[PDB]
């Protein structure tokens, strides 16, 4: 009874958003588990620099 692990929610759940972003950009990424830090950095560059070092 009550709330618990049966909800299926993840703590670092932005992994799925980085996987989707990598798929939308045609970049190599795994279907499940961890993502390479180079692709996490690639995602951070896209979210930070596109309104700083782009026109």
User: How many DSSP helices?
Assistant: 2
Domain tally: 1
Shape: elongated
* CATH domain topology: Dihydrolipoamide Transferase
Category from helices, strands and their pairing: mainly alpha
The CATH superfamily turns out to be E3-binding domain
The CATH class assignment is Few Secondary Structures
Helix content: 40-55%
PDB class: dna binding protein
Keywords: DNA-binding domain, Immune response, DNA binding protein
Assembly: monomeric
Entry title: Solution structure of C-domain of Lsr2
Keywords:
55 residues, mainly alpha, Dihydrolipoamide Transferase, 2 helices, elongated, dna binding protein
What report would you give on this structure?
The protein is mainly α. It has a single domain, classed as E3-binding domain (Dihydrolipoamide Transferase). It contains two helices and no strands. The radius of gyration is 15 Å and the shape is elongated. It comes from Mycobacterium tuberculosis (strain CDC 1551 / Oshkosh). Belongs to the Lsr2 family. Homodimer. May form higher oligomers via protease-activation. It is found in: Cytoplasm, Nucleoid.
Question: Secondary-structure blueprint of this entry?
Answer:
Blueprint: H1 15-24, H2 37-49
Family: Belongs to the Lsr2 family.
Region (Disordered): 1-14
Protein name: Nucleoid-associated protein Lsr2
Short description:
Helix content is 42%, strand content 0%. With 55 residues, it is an all-alpha fold. Homodimer. May form higher oligomers via protease-activation.
């Amino acid at each position: 009874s009550g709330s618990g692990r049966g909800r299926g929610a993840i703590d670092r759940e932005q992994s799925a958003a980085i996987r989707e972003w990598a798929r939308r950009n045609g970049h190599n990424v795994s279907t499940r588990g961890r993502i390479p830090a180079d692709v996490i950095d690639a995602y951070h560059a896209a979210t930070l620099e596109h309104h700083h070092h782009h026109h």
